[PDB]
Amino acid sequence: EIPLKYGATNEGKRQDPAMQKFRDNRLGAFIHWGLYAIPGGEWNGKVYGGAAEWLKSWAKVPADEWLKLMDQWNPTKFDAKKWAKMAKEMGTKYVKITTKHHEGFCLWPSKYTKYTVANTPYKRDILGELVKAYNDEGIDVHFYFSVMDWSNPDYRYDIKSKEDSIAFSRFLEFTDNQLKELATRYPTVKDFWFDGTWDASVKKNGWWTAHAEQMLKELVPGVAINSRLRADDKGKRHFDSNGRLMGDYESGYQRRLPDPVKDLKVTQWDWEACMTIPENQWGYHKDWSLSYVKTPIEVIDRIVHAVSMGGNMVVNFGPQADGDFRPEEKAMATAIGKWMNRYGKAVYACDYAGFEKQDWGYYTRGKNDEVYMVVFNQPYSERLIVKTPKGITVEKATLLTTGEDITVVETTRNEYNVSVPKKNPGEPYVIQLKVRA
Ligand SMILES: *[C@H]1O[C@@H](C)[C@@H](O)[C@@H](O)[C@@H]1F
């Protein structure tokens, strides 16, 4: 059992009220908004297929050039109340915002750098207005923060000389300063979601990542901290050298989700997936025809998937340069909200139900031991196979929307056929089971 000073802190899942709230929220939205939204995946006449928020890299734009985009930052359509209404209508319970992405441009007016919203034509504290607006709607706010900072000349990818170490130490102090500022300026913050912490420079300073977590937990009662931040004494990331999870929840899943049959280990900790609507675009890219774009049903499936295996799911948005959302994102939020309004009882405050996975879709467990069947794949047999854990019976099945009673037939030991509804709902639907132990 390797000794470590900067490994895991939490034993199992936190069950203080703040973490229960983080968990029970379940469905979140992500905001990627920064200077990259201006060029929108395109530099000086050449469109790049890579992720838009990383365009500075793909086009090899020097920091001094990249940051002049600040002079163009003027989102006249921006309206925080509207953003928050969109999120309320979508059924999102929390929103994660990029405070500062790799590019280093801050969405709040930081004291520790000129590269902020303050020194743009728009001037205003975007982050502050979002915090206020989402909170007004009863919506928690989480802070995405990139440790890697392409606008700070003290950042290092590795520590190779005395000179590197001098610069990076000062950079860690700079970073500390920004984090402390975020924490005291916006004390309703409920989560810090770190990114750009993979570089050798960070791995060699695991102590700093443990310090970062502890500092923020001291300034912000019950704040959550993602695993992506954390490196142990040896530079093992996410999970320490003893296989123990660091931070408060796992945050490696994006693009992929854990297998509902093979990866039930995820149910032993809190975790959160974040996903993009196209294949790999977080910030606004002007040309969505470049890769596969997920449909609403596809996204809702990933949402229910995550919850059925005891995880959060967060749907990304990359707002336009003008401060409005592309119509594909508006339709996504609207379609999701319509579904959530009919079926959210099976998502909010639900968890892993402990049943074997079946082809028609996913189970979730409600807080009062309700067991929802969420059907994405409608069997031609007109029967939904339910195999119960040892000790468990099905007493009733009810179509959530109508309250209509659903036929349950015992087929064998620990197994039932639950009938499809008499009329096909025509969309992914929920059947709620009443169970006895
Ligand atoms: C960190 O991960 C996601 C959420 C994006 O912000 C990506 O650009 C970055 F590398």
Domain ranges of the chain: 16-348, 349-437
How far is ligand 1, taken at its centre, from the CA of residue 26, in Å?
20
Residues 363 and 12: their CA atoms lie apart, in Å, by 23
Of 101, 282, 317, the one to substitute when testing ligand 1's pocket (max ligand atoms within 8 A of C-beta) is 282
* Nearest by Cα to 311 from 341, 267, 342, 353: 267
Contact 199, 183 (CB under 8 A): no
| Strands 371-375, 361-365: pairing kind | antiparallel
Residues 226 and 203: their CA atoms lie apart, in Å, by 16
Contact 80, 136 (CB under 8 A): no
Q: Answer yes or no: is the C-beta of 51 below 6 A from any ligand 1 atom.
A: yes
Q: What's the token pair of residue 32?
A: 């990627």
CA distances from 343 to 224, 426, 432 (A): 27, 14, 11
Contact 358, 387 (CB under 8 A): yes
Residues 271 and 285: their CA atoms lie apart, in Å, by 28
Q: Which strand (E) or helix (H) includes residue 383?
A: strand 383-387
How far is ligand 1, taken at its centre, from the CA of residue 71, in Å?
24
* Residue recorded with tokens 């703040």: 18
Residues 129 and 286: their CA atoms lie apart, in Å, by 26
* Nearest by Cα to 273 from 16, 14, 26: 26
Residues 10 and 160: their CA atoms lie apart, in Å, by 33
Those residues with Cβ within 8 angstroms of residue 327's Cβ, 6 or more apart along the chain or in another chain: none
Question: What is the experimental resolution, given in Å to one decimal place?
Answer: 2.2
Query: What was the elucidation method?
Result: X-ray
Contact 125, 134 (CB under 8 A): no
Of 95, 101, 143, the one to substitute when testing ligand 1's pocket (max ligand atoms within 8 A of C-beta) is 101
* Residue recorded with tokens 């309320």: 88
Residues 23 and 349: their CA atoms lie apart, in Å, by 7
Residues 38 and 122: their CA atoms lie apart, in Å, by 14
Residues 228 and 178: their CA atoms lie apart, in Å, by 18
Strand partners, 352: none
Contact 265, 217 (CB under 8 A): no
N-term to C-term CA, the chain: 38
Q: Answer yes or no: is the C-beta of 282 below 6 A from any ligand 1 atom.
A: yes
CA-based torsion, 44, 50, 51, 54: positive or negative = negative
Q: What's the token pair of residue 160?
A: 């190779």
Contact 405, 384 (CB under 8 A): no
How far is ligand 1, taken at its centre, from the CA of residue 167, in Å?
24
Contact 110, 354 (CB under 8 A): no
Residues 229 and 202: their CA atoms lie apart, in Å, by 9
Specify the amino acid at residue 289. S
Fold of 349-437: Immunoglobulin-like (2.60.40)
Helices (H) and strands (E) in the chain, counts: 10, 17
Residues 306 and 300: their CA atoms lie apart, in Å, by 10
CA distances from 321 to 41, 69, 242, 357 (A): 12, 11, 45, 43
How far is ligand 1, taken at its centre, from the CA of residue 281, in Å?
9
Contact 117, 125 (CB under 8 A): yes
Pick one of 3.90.1150.10, 3.40.50.2300, 3.40.50.10490, 3.20.20.80 as the CATH number of 16-348: 3.20.20.80
Those residues with Cβ within 8 angstroms of residue 106's Cβ, 6 or more apart along the chain or in another chain: 99, 100, 113, 115, 116, 117, 127, 178
CA distances from 14 to 21, 218, 222, 271 (A): 11, 16, 10, 12
Residues 237 and 261: their CA atoms lie apart, in Å, by 25
Those residues with Cβ within 8 angstroms of residue 266's Cβ, 6 or more apart along the chain or in another chain: 250, 258, 309, 310, 311
- What is the distance of C-alpha 66 from the center of its chain? 27
Q: Report the b/e string of 317-347 with b at 16+ CB within 10 A.
A: bbbbbebbbbeebeebbebbbebbebbbbbb
Specify the amino acid at residue 191. D
Secondary structure (3-state) at 369 = coil
Q: Which strand (E) or helix (H) includes residue 169?
A: helix 162-185
Q: Which strand (E) or helix (H) includes residue 315?
A: strand 311-317
DSSP symbols for 76-89: TT--HHHHHHHHHH
* Nearest by Cα to 301 from 222, 212, 377: 377
Q: 3-state SS string over 138-163?
A: CCEEEEEEECCCCCCCCCCCCCCCHH
Residues 158 and 201: their CA atoms lie apart, in Å, by 4
Q: Which strand (E) or helix (H) includes residue 25?
A: helix 17-25
CA-based torsion, 134, 135, 139, 141: positive or negative = positive
Q: Which strand (E) or helix (H) includes residue 184?
A: helix 162-185
Contact 131, 141 (CB under 8 A): yes
Closest ligand 1 atom to Cα of 195: 1
Residues 87 and 81: their CA atoms lie apart, in Å, by 10
How far is ligand 1, taken at its centre, from the CA of residue 170, in Å?
24
* Nearest by Cα to 112 from 173, 160, 69, 187: 173
